[PDB]
């Protein structure tokens, strides 16, 4: 395992829908202004990122970076098409290379399949293909001091693992020291039998956390049982990244936002949302 | 507005993935056995149902019927393709005709758009086309003593209305006395600011209710705040259909199950699930 600490982050889409020079600065300035320790960069196309520009911004604002992504149909490592798995392998290596160049240590999110709606259930072969790709990625990342964190997401976003317990079985199949479970309270609110079971089962295997409200808006305005969740994190003495994640039609990443079906305005003022989110989380954990 | 009564129902997919002669008898006998007042028949293809045989089964088991459906891409009444809207109008007329023939009075579900994951947000034209379609359907249904109930569903299943408050603004534009809001606790768990706000706002305009757990399995084994939801129903003295809705990979409807991304086995025993659900609901309402 590469070093993890208790640190608080904001997902780029709280502030910015692109990673242009302007968009990168808007997101990094926004995270720093609210007092976050790190920005989580959305790396859906890691060839698009200006690495030198981004490193200069992280140094300018004294901010750390982690990275998350989802694969697409063209890069789906669950595919029975060996050429598509190979394109997925290539994108994940590029994402790892970008994160390394930014001095980051965490590549998280839906790195194990195409993010979005599958037309049917996953086969044993789809799952086996994903596990092998995550072994190859974990080994590549390990050479660069990077941990990979497999995000459990809801049924509309993957057919591979929708609960923490399914995620832990997948993780154990990957069987690599720098691979961890990533839990997201928004996804857990749909799929889990309460908000404690998966955290208590994970213990030291839990390597990354996303804090999202039931509707992905302001924390404490939805249905998520944060009290039970933070009680469980305390029980396992979780000391890893905690990212505030929120999506509003106010700020659109043309790819990610439509894949995540962000039809509604849940907020308009990024600074107010992000400030209140960090206060909400620190009141309950730290 | 045609008469509504407080009555408890089971969705057909609790028992049968198809509405064959055999599937219909299994589902109707199952709903009767569990002590439900009605079965909710899924009419995604209303030409597929043997109406006379179903009528005989309803009489045989002393059961009532209501109907729900979702449209598909080919029948999407939000489409800017007038030929697709016409196919949707035709499907909804046929569904109304089947419901009338079964002596039912409620056509509910995702009747105002294609059920499933839109690749992008709805245009003003998409919303206008949906409103107009629901006016034409309401007027057709009114001639056969049928109410229509527009089911608010989550972002992954419609881009038109994801909260009760959005549904009520939509119904204001429809402006038909036999058009009602339909709320579903599974969808509310994702999209709503708590489980009361939309119910209190709807009052008499709430015409239909689905009871679904957060993961669509056994009631009480997920995250839905049923205490808050049933309290709100009591506060408006809701007197209309309440249908238990649940999906497991155990019982598959080739189309609907994959649209709803039902990847997991949440149950195997239809009678245990349906009996426990009815007891769960009656202990908390009526
Ligand atoms: O909640 C849902 C879909 O998620 C159901 O109630 C469907 O709308 C209905 O059409 C199934 O028959
Ligand atoms: O919860 C998520 C998706 O629903 C993930 O955090 C998201 O896909 C990230 O990969 C965005 O960078
Ligand atoms: O890998 C796919 C999988 O996790 O999909 C969900 C199922 O519940 C589980 O048994 C697996 O088939
Ligand atoms: Mg007869
Ligand atoms: Mn997340
Ligand atoms: Mn429903």
UniProtKB/Swiss-Prot annotation, chains A, B:
Binding site for D-allulose: 11, 68, 151, 157, 187, 210, 216, 245
Metal-binding recorded as keyword: yes
Active site residues of this protein: 151 (proton donor/acceptor), 245 (proton donor/acceptor)
Catalysed reactions, semicolon-separated: L-ribulose = L-xylulose; D-ribulose = D-xylulose; D-allulose = keto-D-fructose; keto-L-tagatose = keto-L-sorbose
Cofactor requirements of the protein: Mn(2+)
InterPro entries named in the record: IolE/XylAMocC-like, Xyl_isomerase-like_sf, Xyl_isomerase-like_TIM-brl
E.C. no: 5.1.3.31
Keyword Protease: no
Domain of life: Bacteria
SUPFAM superfamilies listed in its UniProt record: Xylose isomerase-like
Quaternary context: Homodimer.
Similarity section: Belongs to the hyi family.
Protein's recorded name: L-ribulose 3-epimerase
Protein species of origin: Methylomonas sp. (strain DH-1)
